[PDB]
Amino acid sequence: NGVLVLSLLDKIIGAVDQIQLTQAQLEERQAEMEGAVQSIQGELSKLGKAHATTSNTVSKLLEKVRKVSVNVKTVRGSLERQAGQIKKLEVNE
Amino acid sequence: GVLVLSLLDKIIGAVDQIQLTQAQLEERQAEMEGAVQSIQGELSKLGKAHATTSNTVSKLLEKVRKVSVNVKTVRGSLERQAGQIKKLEVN
Amino acid sequence: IKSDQVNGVLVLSLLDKIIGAVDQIQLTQAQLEERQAEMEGAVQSIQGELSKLGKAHATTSNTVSKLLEKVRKVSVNVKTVRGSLERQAGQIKKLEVNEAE
């Protein structure tokens, strides 16, 4: 039976051997992902500043476009006020 | 003699718990790995999407300027035309 | 190996190293779980921050597609205004040389 005890001992040894190997692999895999995740937060943190900036720009842009359309109306309003003036004079000769 | 076997059983019990715990460790280690790879996916997606939008916005900036300038050349042309007309009004 | 005293020594030293290894594995396994828990919580918060940001960008990309459409509603407006400008210029010069006395 002493043979059965040793027979059972190196089986237990084998198990723990593998469990140690696999758990190494887990420690590694996990370290790796904590790394991935920390990259991602950094980059997500950056893209957020980026967008806030783009956002801020578009608002400027929206205001410039508003100014422009007002000028087109002035210039047009100014324009056929002249057309009226040009009509007045091609009427008197 | 008999003490060694109780030990062995104690150890074996310990070891089997470890084998279950480690298998569920791997399994959600596997899950979060895939969650993380998804997150990199939609992020890097979003990052490109944003570059675009920003390239578009810069192109808009310059379109607006060009227009803005034209509207002013047109205002200035109309100022030259009004001067012209006013002397026609002398006769 | 035939003797008892010696095999006893074998078993003893093996048994003892098995138990040290197992007690380390448990300590490590204790850690692995706590870290896996830390990260489900990080990952979800990341997910939360991220999808929030995509919603942010949608709003913007849409504002831009709007602004893009209003601008060459303004360029249409502008080159009809330029269009009538020299039509006016021609008819003015035609008054100026119609004049030409």
User: DSSP string spanning C13-50?
Assistant: HHHHHHHHHHHHHHHHHHHHHHHHHHHHHHHHHHHHHH
Instruction: Name the one residue in this structure whose structure tokens are 């998804």.
Output: B38
Which residues of chain A have a CB within 8 Å of the CB of B50? Answer: 47, 50-51, 54
Burial of C14 (0-12, 13-18, 19+ CB in 10 A): middle
Closest partner residue to B22 among A23, A44, A47, by Cβ? A23
What residues does each domain of chain A span? 1-93
Closest CA to A9 of C74, B56, A17: A17
Rounded to an integer, what distance in angstroms lies between the CA atom of residue B62 and that of residue A70?
18
Q: Does A50 touch chain C (CB under 8 A)?
A: no
Chain A interface, best mutation among B54, B62, B65, B70, by max A CB count within 10 A: B54
Q: Do B53 and C53 touch (CB under 8 A)?
A: no
Is the CB of residue B71 less than 8 Å from the CB of residue A77?
Answer: no
Rounded Cα distance, A7 and A19, in Å:
19
Q: Please tell me if residue C1 touches chain A, with a CB cutoff of 8 Å.
A: no
Nearest Cα of chain C lies from the Cα of A49 at a distance, in angstroms, of 11
Largest CA distance in chain B: 135
Q: Do B25 and C11 touch (CB under 8 A)?
A: no
Long-range contacts of B51-56 (CB under 8 A, 24+ apart): B53/A54, B53/C57, B53/C60, B53/C61, B53/C64, B54/A50, B54/A54, B56/C64, B56/C68
Inter-residue contact B67 to A68 (CB < 8 Å): yes
> What three-state secondary structure class fits C55?
helix
A44 close contact with C: CB closer than 8 A = yes
C26 contacts chain B (CB < 8 A): yes
Q: CB of B43 within 8 A of CB of A43? A: yes
Radius of gyration of chain B (CA): 39
Tokens 């500043």 found at: A49
Whether the CB-CB separation of C35 and A34 falls below 8 Å is answered with yes
Q: Which of B9, B46, B71 to mutate to test the interface with A (most CBs of A within 10 A)?
A: B71
Method by which the model was determined = X-ray
- Is A41 an interface residue toward C (CB < 8 Å)? yes
Closest CA to A65 of B50, B60, B26: B60
A56 touches chain C (CB under 8 A): no
Cβ–Cβ below 8 Å for C50 and B29: no
Helices marked H in chain B — which ranges?
3-88
A13 contacts chain B (CB < 8 A): no
Nearest to C20 by CA among A26, A16, B17: A16
A78 touches C at CB < 8 Å: no
- Most A CBs within 10 A among C61, C67, C69, C87, hence the mutation to make, goes to C67
Resolution limit in angstroms?
3.0
The two structure tokens encoding residue C34: 């706590």
